Write a protein that binds this ligand. Structure first.
Ligand SMILES: NC(=O)c1ccc[n+]([C@@H]2O[C@H](COP(=O)([O-])OP(=O)(O)OC[C@H]3O[C@@H](n4cnc5c(N)ncnc54)[C@H](O)[C@@H]3O)[C@@H](O)[C@H]2O)c1
Ligand SMILES: C[C@@](O)(CCO)CC(=O)[O-]
Lengths: 384, 374
């Protein structure tokens, strides 16, 4: 059960103990949170360069979250107040209608093999596509362990840019199926592995061989439904809040200035979960925002509609390149503990949870903005 | 002097001591970094909700960084390796040509007063513009202290959207000059303060009254110059690396897939400095990426050119809404220490340093990508 009565009123230690026997955490786990210094300086000096100490941020746990029926405790790490309070409140509201319904796609990341110096980019493109299976085999032969787990290269997509400032270019895409890893290093290696062969076929000169953070092939989805009766406040009625939420969305869909803050709200829920799991939060931000302006217009990441049943339905679909076997995820004592609290067994499972927390946050942010204002809640929670 | 010989080889304690007497830090400061738990649980339980403990990340210090002649030590907080090593290396290279040259604009943030229900958005627009000074006075009367420091409302910009899915809308912008604060709360209050008056003039129904993180009015700039001779490697020559760096930029400027990673690298340097200062890293990310696609095309945040002198010149201009008097910046013992190491006296001073670290990072990321080929 994710519901935690009077949890916000409970003392930190009381909370850590409650969460402890609830999940059945060993003392060895509770001690990592009980005392400061869970990350030894010998390990901290192994992650970054020029380490002189450690910086710490609050480690909270959101409640009420329910993904596909299964209850789950979401660990968050931020400095901004109201975030954990809103994510949990909206999560409580979604419960009454089935919580959050999520889904995802195969962990498909893609490398880029930039080739310049070609005089016939278009012709050379077909040369690559026709010898695609060769290029694929070579890529896989490098990372066979990945193929053992069911991952590996799946397909190649060659694109051209004859309008490049520095002459025509040929950018081939290696759609590699990573597994429970973000795929950064896995993909980057395959890119540098096939680099020689592609260069031999097109007769060009390979430049960059890096992955693309705009993982539009590794999407994660999340849905919610909010009955008007649930949003009925003392002043405003249920119906009144729904229209407001809809106006707030229309605004963000047409004006980039509002879209910026709107999407920022979404990230406020996703980022904290990423830092806690030890994942690269910057990769998530880059793929999120870039996907938000894929139609030549910076728009909203979430969508808020009112089904023909009167209910408020919102969704969230965005690139979610997150892992479980990554570098920092395995070396940080708390990163491993975060995964244990979540109970996630795969990267995509974690991905689905991340987009659910975001969809919830955005809902809470807009509900307040349309209800009264933003100061009442945030500022109250923003004491001192 | 920001140069730190064999700093990377020095032990953590050795580094903390070296940084200690260099800056003349008291034992009270060094102890915050020496021992774990610089952030007491009573304070940690006051920032976020449902706090059960604390999460810690490495706290590093980049070297060689020189902004406008003045040397400075940049504190960074990340989990990804190579970041602090690259930012410091490229910083060492920029030294030979004057380090980094930065500049900024007045800390101008802007609120949004969305007004729906108006049947004549365009006409109602002029009604607001003509009674602008009234709306301005009311806004300032609220935050009297801000005006004492030289901040306060400066101008109002009303925009219309008759093409909105939910009918026509009227979005007025309150260009408020915050000072050393990000302006979030300062601006949000003024927006809700003028909300009634605007509603009276246009006859509409005010909806949202929130700030816009796309702070394109609070820009920060940074420039660098890299002599080809400096980039000359064992295999590749100086000239050879410059062209590669240029190819790498052209790629990001035309293709969004490369731009995403390109800009990600820039943030790899800016974000760590933000977390260390206790600032909202997410606001920075939102304003950064949104500004990257302001021309209907997601492009590069930095620019790499080759002056008619043969040298490689790069720049960086982006929204930098960062503060010094914010909520978390003041309550975190280390956030205050980070500001002390930086020696910054204003928010914009910190803003200029943030864009310099980013411009350096992007340079290092591309240099490597172009250097070690097939
Ligand atoms: N990014 C967003 O969309 C968003 C929105 C709302 C709140 N927030 C949160 O609010 C915080 C940032 O808001 P804030 O920094 O405006 O709030 P704040 O209240 O902490 O700081 C502003 C206050 O500081 C005072 N002040 C003193 N000296 C000042 C100076 N020299 N210059 C400017 N103001 C000065 C002012 O009186 C003002 O009331 C962050 O913690 C952020 O998480 C973010
Ligand atoms: C609440 C908000 O206006 C500010 C986030 O601090 C953003 C959003 O609408 O999602």
């Amino acid at each position: 059960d994710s519901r935690l009565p009077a949890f916000r009123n409970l003392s930190p230690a009381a909370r850590l103990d409650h969460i402890g026997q609830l999940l059945g955490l060993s003392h060895d786990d509770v001690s990592l949170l009980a005392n400061a210094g869970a990350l030894p300086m010998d390990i901290a000096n192994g992650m970054i360069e020029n380490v002189i100490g450690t910086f710490e941020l609050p480690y909270a746990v959101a409640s009420n979250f329910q993904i596909n029926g299964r209850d789950v405790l979401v660990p968050l790490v931020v400095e901004e107040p109201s975030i954990v309070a809103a994510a949990s409140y909206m999560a409580k509201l979604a419960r009454a209608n089935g919580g959050f319904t999520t889904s995802s796609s195969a962990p498909l990341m893609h490398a880029q093999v930039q080739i310049v110096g070609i005089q016939d980019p278009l012709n050379a493109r077909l040369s690559l596509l026709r010898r695609k299976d060769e290029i694929i085999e070579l890529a896989n032969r490098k990372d066979q362990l990945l193929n053992s787990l069911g991952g590996g290269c799946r397909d190649i997509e060659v694109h051209t840019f004859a309008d490049t400032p520095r002459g025509p270019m040929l950018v081939a895409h290696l759609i590699v199926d990573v597994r429970d890893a973000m795929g950064a290093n896995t993909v980057n290696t395959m890119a540098e592995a096939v680099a020689p062969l592609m260069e031999a076929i097109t007769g060009g000169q390979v430049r960059l061989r890096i992955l693309s953070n705009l993982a539009d092939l590794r999407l994660a989805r999340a849905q919610v439904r909010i009955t008007p009766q649930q949003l009925e406040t003392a002043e405003f009625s249920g119906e009144a809040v729904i229209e407001g939420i809809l106006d707030a969305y229309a605004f963000a869909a047409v004006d980039p200035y509002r879209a910026a803050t709107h999407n920022k709200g979404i990230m406020n829920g996703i980022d904290p979960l990423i830092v806690a799991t030890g994942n690269d939060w910057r990769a998530v931000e880059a793929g999120a925002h870039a996907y938000a302006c894929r139609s030549g217009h910076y728009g909203s990441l979430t969508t808020w509609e009112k089904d023909n049943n009167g209910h408020l339905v919102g969704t969230l679909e965005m690139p979610m390149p997150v892992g479980l076997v990554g570098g920092a995820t395995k070396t940080h004592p708390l990163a491993q503990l975060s995964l244990r609290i979540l109970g996630v067994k795969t990267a995509q499972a974690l991905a689905e949870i991340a987009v659910a927390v975001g969809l919830a946050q955005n809902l809470g942010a807009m509900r307040a903005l349309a209800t009264e204002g933003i100061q009442r809640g945030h500022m109250a929670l923003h004491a001192r």
